[PDB]
Structure 1
Amino acid sequence: RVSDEEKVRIAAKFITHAPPGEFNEVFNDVRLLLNNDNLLREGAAHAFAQYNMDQFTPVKIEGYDDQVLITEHGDLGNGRFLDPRNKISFKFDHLRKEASDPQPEDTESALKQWRDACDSALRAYVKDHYPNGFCTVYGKSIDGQQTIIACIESHQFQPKNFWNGRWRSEWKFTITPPTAQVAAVLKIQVHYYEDGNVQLVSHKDIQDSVQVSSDVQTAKEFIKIIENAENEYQTAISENYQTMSDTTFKALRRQLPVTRTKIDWNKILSYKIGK
């Protein structure tokens, strides 16, 4: 019913589910809770890696001006990741903040044509809509089919004011001329924790069918798909906030009693309709 293997999996789940910008606090908590560093090291590396990966952790390679996104798609598999833009190889150290000692990565250069266009075409989209955003487009071959994978990340961490937030968007473009199919997932997570624990957890899954033309053309067609879908998503979110605050919230608890004055407790403690 209980085993060290189960405790390790539990510890791992907690660690990989830390909210943005709070990995260490959660890790230290779990470490003191598990109270067995030998077991903790069993899945640490795996935990750290998975976290940074699903969190699209923006990292800065030794000296490229390189804010690159750590994702699965860039996971070499040997303990190193891909930087499709600068196109090098970089080893990411999970505990420490830095990832250094890069390796040139001469490519396959098959889908790269599309890849390089979308990348800096999207890089423009991002600079226009994400205050502290970064993007990484992956050109790759997925079991025969060519696909462009653009990953966008944006965050704001203010622990001294007890809050952190992050945006994550992933668009998978699978090409099948003339027209191709789109698949994406938009994600938002916000955490406020001064004398409480409040969180916005939201995500939207979208699938689209797009017409494929040129290289610089299909790219701008994509950045357009994304722009419209993400603006629509964000729009639906601000609207939801509006309704929750002016309809749902007010339907829960009134601001003042129906009697329209604070409660007369002496009256509640005695005065009856009849017994």
Structure 2
Amino acid sequence: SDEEKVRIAAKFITHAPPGEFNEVFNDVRLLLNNDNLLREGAAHAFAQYNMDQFTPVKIEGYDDQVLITEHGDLGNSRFLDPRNQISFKFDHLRKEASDPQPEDGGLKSWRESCDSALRAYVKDHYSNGFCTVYAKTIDGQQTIIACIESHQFQPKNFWNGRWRSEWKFTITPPSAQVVGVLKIQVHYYEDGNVQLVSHKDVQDSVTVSNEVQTTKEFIKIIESAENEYQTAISENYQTMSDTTFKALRRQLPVTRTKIDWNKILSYKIGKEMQNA
């Protein structure tokens, strides 16, 4: 059925490697061979993808880009920038912002206390990343959501990469839970395809003060946590060749010398004595 064929299209599209949505989309369109079906069905899948990517976009005439997220989804293909307190229509196919409208409670103080400290963490540690503080109330609890994205794409060096991150804090006086999720994807396509995909949960708790100093607790945790996660990854790639990647296949035999294909019967005889 064209519903299932379109369902298979959403499968393929929503797994597109970061920065390669357009290249997947053209082939999926041409293989489906129906722009009308794809324009009526896949408009959900494109939105699913642009949220999963925390897609950054430049609002025209404004000083910083904004991150497309479910935490900013207003329906109608509108999204919120909580920094300027304005919403825009977003083109989920073209990645264009349009129609900036005013989109003005007690979370404001927190929204600010956090955002400048978060932009300081971005300025300190990210080369070309972005961030946003969304804020919401859940069952009367004040909930602050801090989002980070970084993405380098180089279709002339043949590699694409992304480092997304999301954090939650909920005011539970004199304390809070801290929930973090760190997500990475990367792909290299020079004469072969190699892909890293990796997600980590982080969780901790904090003791409250005024909003300002409480924010510096939040950032000091996030800094320590991302520093440890990236450290763990660097040590892991410096250790896999002799442990994990060594598990699947051995770089060289226990002999530490290539096989001597003349002698090949001799390699039986140890295992003969395990039956003897």
Q: Same fold (TM over 0.5)?
A: yes
Cα-to-partner distance string for 1:178-211 (whole Å, 9 max, x where unaligned): 1111111000111112222211111111222211
Question: Matched residue of 2:70: which SS?
Answer: coil
Tell which deviates more after alignment, 32-41 or 125-134.
32-41
Question: Matched residue of 2:17: which SS?
Answer: coil
Q: Is the 8 A contact 2:6 2:42 kept in 1?
A: no
* Separation of aligned partners in 1, 2:252 and 2:25: 43
Report how far residue 214 of structure 1 moved: 0.8
Question: Matched residue of 1:73: which SS?
Answer: helix
Structure 1 partner of 2:229: 233
Question: Matched residue of 1:25: which SS?
Answer: helix
* Separation of aligned partners in 1, 2:160 and 2:73: 26
Q: Is the 8 A contact 1:16 1:47 kept in 2?
A: yes
Q: Is the 8 A contact 1:62 1:101 kept in 2?
A: no
User: Please, what TM-score do these two structures have when normalized by structure 2?
Assistant: 0.90
Task: Name structure 2 gaps, 5 residues minimum.
Answer: 272-276
Question: Matched residue of 1:239: which SS?
Answer: helix
Tell which deviates more after alignment, 227-236 or 145-154.
227-236
Report how far residue 130 of structure 1 moved: 1.1
Distance 1:65 1:260, change over 3 A: same
Distance 1:193 1:221, change over 3 A: same
Note if 1:80 corresponds to 2:78.
yes
* Separation of aligned partners in 2, 1:128 and 1:84: 22
* Separation of aligned partners in 2, 1:176 and 1:117: 17
Report how far residue 237 of structure 1 moved: 1.3
Q: Is the 8 A contact 1:121 1:223 kept in 2?
A: yes
Distance 1:274 1:13, change over 3 A: closer
Report how far residue 42 of structure 1 moved: 2.4
Q: Is the 8 A contact 1:179 1:209 kept in 2?
A: yes
2:140 to 137, 144, 162: 144
Report how far residue 258 of structure 1 moved: 5.6
User: Please, what TM-score do these two structures have when normalized by structure 1?
Assistant: 0.90
Cα-to-partner distance string for 1:81-127 (whole Å, 9 max, x where unaligned): 11111221111112223212211222xx2211111111111111011
Question: Matched residue of 1:266: which SS?
Answer: coil
Distance 1:213 1:256, change over 3 A: closer
Q: Is the 8 A contact 2:13 2:25 kept in 1?
A: yes
Distance 1:266 1:6, change over 3 A: same
1:104 to 98, 102, 105: 102
Distance 1:10 1:21, change over 3 A: same
* Separation of aligned partners in 2, 1:210 and 1:200: 32
Question: Matched residue of 1:273: which SS?
Answer: helix
Distance 1:25 1:177, change over 3 A: same
Tell which deviates more after alignment, 35-44 or 12-21.
35-44
**Number of corresponding residues:** 271
Distance 1:246 1:66, change over 3 A: same
* Separation of aligned partners in 2, 1:117 and 1:192: 39
Distance 1:101 1:211, change over 3 A: same
Report how far residue 155 of structure 1 moved: 0.9
* Separation of aligned partners in 2, 1:220 and 1:274: 63
Report how far residue 161 of structure 1 moved: 1.9
* Separation of aligned partners in 1, 2:267 and 2:71: 70
Question: Matched residue of 2:267: which SS?
Answer: coil
Task: Name structure 1 gaps, 5 residues minimum.
Answer: none
Distance 1:175 1:33, change over 3 A: same
Report how far residue 246 of structure 1 moved: 3.5
* Separation of aligned partners in 2, 1:181 and 1:272: 59
Q: Is the 8 A contact 1:182 1:207 kept in 2?
A: yes
Cα-to-partner distance string for 1:18-72 (whole Å, 9 max, x where unaligned): 1110001111222222223232122322122111111111111011022111100
Q: Is the 8 A contact 1:12 1:47 kept in 2?
A: yes
Distance 1:17 1:260, change over 3 A: closer
